[PDB]
Structure formats: structure tokens, C-alpha cells
């Protein structure tokens, strides 16, 4: 006989809480995007859909997954409801890495092609993306279904309902998990290059400019202060058209002669070019502080399945060599860690974003009116 119920209840208090910090944390991240109007780009739009997923793994994959540790890991449901329950899990898991490779990807094309942004900003551009991911994932998990359900050998190991095959094991851990790990930690290190490039390069015109408004100042010929302006009008094009006509004011008072009259006039330019330092060197202030707080999302992904990564993979390379029930003891564990990664995508925002931190704290006294 088997099915058992048994005494593993300290897991019982433990997976309980896993799952409501998960379902209430992403709950009002989806409400934080749903209303609050400073996160609609299609960056937050990818962690709402993100946090879909990460709730739906509360709901459907961790209560059952705690219901087997309630009856000694012996499958308690129907038998064709173990390749479901695998593919839910799988599913949401493939969804959340695609995701997140996703939104760095779209983040770096974002910074390369600054005009493309503006056309890209489509709230339905940024679905059609999402739209593009869940149907890459439905599509890669799709064997587990189509296989497992076929065949009860490829889903049950000894009347524990787990991924017993080792194809599906192995090269969906590539298909569907370092061909997007490949991609996220290519793409986010390039983000970092491209926003240390032009950072470095807007310091760069920054002295350039501020070493012109010396020149034009202590100048006494119409070429003297020519020149200088059309190094200024040069370096002020590789920002970006808002200052250019300004110089190109001061450019034709040079061009005639009228030196004190085209002197007076870069004094006029300065504090227009003071504006627009701070106001794009704020801009990539902004986006290298996004850029940080977009990594710990893609870190904690990374390091919270990793010891289930592993070990689940050793388990297939010692198919021989090792203790069968420590390492699935440790798999029991070790995508629980992986499960707890779904609760810390919200804690993450709220540390790290004022306006994921007002907006959860306005819904937990119940006000919605932004
Ligand atoms: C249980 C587990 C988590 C809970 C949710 C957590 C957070 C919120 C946001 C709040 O503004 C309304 C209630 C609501 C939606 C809760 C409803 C009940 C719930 C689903
Ligand atoms: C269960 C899943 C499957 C489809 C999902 C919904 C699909 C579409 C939307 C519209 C969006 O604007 C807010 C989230 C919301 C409402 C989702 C919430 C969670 C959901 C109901
Ligand atoms: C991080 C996780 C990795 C690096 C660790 C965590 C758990 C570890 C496993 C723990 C138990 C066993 C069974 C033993 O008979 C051989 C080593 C082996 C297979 C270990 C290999 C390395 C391992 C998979
Ligand atoms: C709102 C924006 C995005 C959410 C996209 C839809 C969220 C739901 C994900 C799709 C899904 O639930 O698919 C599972 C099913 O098993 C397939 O046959
Ligand atoms: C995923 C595709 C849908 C698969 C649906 C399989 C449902 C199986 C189910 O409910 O269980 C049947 C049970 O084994 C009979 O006693
Ligand atoms: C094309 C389908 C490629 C996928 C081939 C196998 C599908 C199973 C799958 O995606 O498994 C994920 C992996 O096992 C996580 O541990
Ligand atoms: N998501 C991976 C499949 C899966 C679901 N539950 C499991 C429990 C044990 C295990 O080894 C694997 C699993
Ligand atoms: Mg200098």
C-alpha cells in the first residue's frame, strides 16, 4: 500500500507561507502597472506579465508541490495530472527566463536605436513581444504534455510524479535555459558598455563645450571665435537641434565680424547648455540606476536556481555514481529555493523603486486613486 499521509508539517508551515508572499506580492505588482501611470513603458509592462507568471506558479504548481511533501512525496492526485502539474511548472519557469532575457534585450535595442525607442514605446508593440514569449513557451513545453501524458514512464519515478525523462531533462536545460541565460548575460553586459560609452561620451562634450566658452571669451579676431563656435556647433550636433540655431545665431555674427556682439551671445548659450547637461546626464543617471536594479531581478533568477539547476543535472551524468535519494532529497529542497525566487521579484521593486513603494503601500490601506 502507499498514498500516505505523514508528519512532514514543519515543511507544511514553511511552503504555506512560500506561496501567499507570492501571490500577494505579484498580485500588487500587476496592480502597480494596471494603474499607477509612471510605469507605463514596456519594461515594467514585461515585469507585470513577469509577475503573472510568478503568481500563477503561486496558485497552481506550489500548493500541489507542497501536497506531495503532505503525503511522502507519493503523487495524491490522478495519474494524467502529473504531466500537467510538470508542464504548469516547467511553463511559468521558461516564461519568467525568456522574460527576463527578453526585457534586457529590449532594453539594449532601447539604447542603440534611440529613435526606434520612440516608435517601440507602443503599448501593443511591447504585448506583441510578450505575445511572441508565452507562445516561444508554450511551444518549448509542449513535449511534456504531448509525451508524458502518453507515457506515464517519462513523468512518474516510482509513484513519485516528477520529470523522470532525461532527454527532456537535458536538452530542454539548453534549449530552453542557457540559449536565453546566453542572451540576458551578453545583452546586459553590453547595456552596461553602451550607457558607459555615452556616458563618457557626453563628459567628453561637456569639456569641449565648457573649453569653447573659455576661448570665446578671452578672443580678439572674427576667427578666433569662428572657430571655437564651429567646434561648439560640431559637438553640440553629437549630442543628440534645441541649441544649434542658437550658435548658428552666434555663428553669423562671427561671419561678419561683430566679435564683443558674438561674444555676448555664448554667454546667452551657456546656461542652455547647462539645462540640457543636466538634464540627458540625468537621463543616463536614470538608466544605469534601471540598469542595476534590472540585474538583481536577473541575479536572484540566476542564484535561487542554481542549486536546482545542478543537482538535477547530476543526477543524469551520475545515472550510476551517486545516492539516487540524497540527490532527489536535495531536488526536494532545492526548487523550493527556486520557488522563493517568485516572492522576491516584487521585494526587489519595493526597495529599489519610490513609485512600486507608494503605490503598494496606497493598496495595503486600500487606496486606488493614484
Ligand atoms: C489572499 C492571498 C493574497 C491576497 C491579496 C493580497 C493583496 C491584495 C491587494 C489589496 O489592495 C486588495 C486585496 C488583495 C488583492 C488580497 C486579496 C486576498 C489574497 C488573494
Ligand atoms: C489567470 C490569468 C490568465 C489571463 C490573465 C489576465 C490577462 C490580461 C490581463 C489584462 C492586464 O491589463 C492586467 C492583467 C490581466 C487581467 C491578467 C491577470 C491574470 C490572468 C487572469
Ligand atoms: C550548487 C549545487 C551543486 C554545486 C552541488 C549541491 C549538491 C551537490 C551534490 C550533493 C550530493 C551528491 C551525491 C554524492 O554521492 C556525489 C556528489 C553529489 C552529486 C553532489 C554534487 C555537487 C552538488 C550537485
Ligand atoms: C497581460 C499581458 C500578458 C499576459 C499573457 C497571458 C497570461 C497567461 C499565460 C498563458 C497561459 O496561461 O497558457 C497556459 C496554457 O497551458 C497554454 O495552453
Ligand atoms: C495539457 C493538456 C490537457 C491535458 C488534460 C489531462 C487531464 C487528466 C485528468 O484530469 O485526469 C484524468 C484521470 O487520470 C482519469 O481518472
Ligand atoms: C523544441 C522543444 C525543446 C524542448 C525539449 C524538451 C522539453 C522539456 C523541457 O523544456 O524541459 C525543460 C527542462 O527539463 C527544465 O528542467
Ligand atoms: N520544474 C521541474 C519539474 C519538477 C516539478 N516538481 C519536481 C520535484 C522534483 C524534481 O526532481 C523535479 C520536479
Ligand atoms: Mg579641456
Given at each position: 500500500?502507499?498514498?500516505?499521509?505523514?508528519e512532514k508539517n514543519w515543511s507544511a508551515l514553511l511552503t504555506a507561507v512560500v506561496i501567499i508572499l507570492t501571490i500577494a506580492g505579484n498580485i500588487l505588482v500587476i496592480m502597480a502597472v494596471s494603474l499607477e501611470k509612471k510605469l507605463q513603458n514596456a519594461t515594467n509592462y514585461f515585469?507585470?506579465?513577469?509577475?503573472?507568471?510568478?503568481?500563477?506558479?503561486?496558485?497552481?504548481?506550489?500548493?500541489?508541490?507542497?501536497?506531495?511533501?503532505?503525503?511522502?512525496?507519493?503523487?495524491?492526485?490522478?495519474?494524467?495530472?502529473?504531466?500537467?502539474?510538470?508542464?504548469?511548472?516547467?511553463?511559468?519557469?521558461?516564461?519568467?527566463?525568456?522574460?527576463?532575457?527578453?526585457?534586457?534585450?529590449?532594453?539594449?535595442?532601447?539604447?542603440?536605436?534611440?529613435?526606434?525607442?520612440?516608435?517601440?514605446?507602443?503599448?501593443?508593440?511591447?504585448?506583441?513581444?510578450?505575445?511572441?514569449?508565452?507562445?516561444?513557451?508554450?511551444?518549448?513545453?509542449?513535449?511534456?504534455?504531448?509525451?508524458?501524458?502518453?507515457?506515464?514512464?517519462?513523468?512518474?519515478?516510482?509513484?513519485?510524479?516528477?520529470?523522470?525523462?532525461?532527454?527532456?531533462?537535458?536538452?530542454?536545460?539548453?534549449?530552453?535555459?542557457?540559449?536565453?541565460?546566453?542572451?540576458?548575460?551578453?545583452?546586459?553586459?553590453?547595456?552596461?558598455?553602451?550607457?558607459?560609452?555615452?556616458?563618457?561620451?557626453?563628459?567628453?562634450?561637456?569639456?569641449?563645450?565648457?573649453?569653447?566658452?573659455?576661448?570665446?571669451?578671452?578672443?580678439?579676431?572674427?576667427?578666433?571665435?569662428?572657430?571655437?563656435?564651429?567646434?561648439?556647433?560640431?559637438?553640440?550636433?553629437?549630442?543628440?537641434?534645441?541649441?544649434?540655431?542658437?550658435?548658428?545665431?552666434?555663428?553669423?555674427?562671427?561671419?561678419?565680424?561683430?566679435?564683443?556682439?558674438?561674444?555676448?551671445?555664448?554667454?546667452?548659450?551657456?546656461?542652455?547648455?547647462?539645462?540640457?547637461?543636466?538634464?540627458?546626464?540625468?537621463?543616463?543617471?536614470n538608466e544605469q540606476k534601471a540598469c542595476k536594479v534590472l540585474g538583481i531581478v536577473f541575479f536572484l533568477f540566476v542564484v535561487m536556481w542554481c542549486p536546482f539547476f545542478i543537482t538535477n543535472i547530476m543526477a543524469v551524468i551520475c545515472k550510476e555514481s551517486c545516492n539516487e535519494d540524497?540527490?532527489?532529497?536535495?531536488?526536494?529542497?532545492?526548487?523550493?529555493?527556486?520557488?522563493?525566487?517568485?516572492?522576491?521579484?516584487?521585494?526587489?521593486?519595493?526597495?529599489?523603486?519610490?513609485?512600486?513603494?507608494?503605490?503598494?503601500?496606497?493598496?495595503?490601506?486600500?487606496?486606488?486613486?493614484?
Amino acid at each position: 500500500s502507499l498514498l500516505h499521509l505523514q508528519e512532514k508539517n514543519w515543511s507544511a508551515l514553511l511552503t504555506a507561507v512560500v506561496i501567499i508572499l507570492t501571490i500577494a506580492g505579484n498580485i500588487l505588482v500587476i496592480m502597480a502597472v494596471s494603474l499607477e501611470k509612471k510605469l507605463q513603458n514596456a519594461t515594467n509592462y514585461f515585469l507585470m506579465s513577469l509577475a503573472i507568471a510568478d503568481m500563477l506558479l503561486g496558485f497552481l504548481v506550489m500548493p500541489v508541490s507542497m501536497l506531495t511533501i503532505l503525503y511522502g512525496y507519493r503523487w495524491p492526485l490522478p495519474s494524467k495530472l502529473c504531466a500537467v502539474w510538470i508542464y504548469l511548472d516547467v511553463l511559468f519557469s521558461t516564461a519568467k527566463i525568456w522574460h527576463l532575457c527578453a526585457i534586457s534585450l529590449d532594453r539594449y535595442v532601447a539604447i542603440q536605436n534611440p529613435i526606434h525607442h520612440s516608435r517601440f514605446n507602443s503599448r501593443t508593440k511591447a504585448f506583441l513581444k510578450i505575445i511572441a514569449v508565452w507562445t516561444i513557451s508554450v511551444g518549448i513545453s509542449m513535449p511534456i504534455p504531448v509525451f508524458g501524458l502518453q507515457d506515464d514512464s517519462k513523468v512518474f519515478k516510482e509513484g513519485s510524479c516528477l520529470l523522470a525523462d532525461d532527454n527532456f531533462v537535458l536538452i530542454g536545460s539548453f534549449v530552453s535555459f542557457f540559449i536565453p541565460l546566453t542572451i540576458m548575460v551578453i545583452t546586459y553586459f553590453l547595456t552596461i558598455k553602451s550607457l558607459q560609452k555615452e556616458a563618457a561620451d557626453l563628459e567628453d562634450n561637456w569639456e569641449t563645450l565648457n573649453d569653447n566658452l573659455k576661448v570665446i571669451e578671452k578672443a580678439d579676431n572674427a576667427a578666433q571665435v569662428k572657430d571655437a563656435l564651429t567646434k561648439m556647433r560640431a559637438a553640440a550636433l553629437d549630442a543628440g537641434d534645441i541649441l544649434v540655431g542658437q550658435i548658428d545665431d552666434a555663428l553669423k555674427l562671427a561671419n561678419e565680424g561683430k566679435v564683443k556682439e558674438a561674444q555676448a551671445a555664448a554667454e546667452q548659450l551657456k546656461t542652455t547648455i547647462n539645462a540640457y547637461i543636466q538634464k540627458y546626464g540625468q537621463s543616463i543617471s536614470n538608466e544605469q540606476k534601471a540598469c542595476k536594479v534590472l540585474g538583481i531581478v536577473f541575479f536572484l533568477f540566476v542564484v535561487m536556481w542554481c542549486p536546482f539547476f545542478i543537482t538535477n543535472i547530476m543526477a543524469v551524468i551520475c545515472k550510476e555514481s551517486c545516492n539516487e535519494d540524497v540527490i532527489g532529497a536535495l531536488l526536494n529542497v532545492f526548487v523550493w529555493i527556486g520557488y522563493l525566487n517568485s516572492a522576491v521579484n516584487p521585494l526587489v521593486y519595493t526597495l529599489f523603486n519610490k513609485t512600486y513603494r507608494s503605490a503598494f503601500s496606497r493598496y495595503i490601506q486600500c487606496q486606488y486613486k493614484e
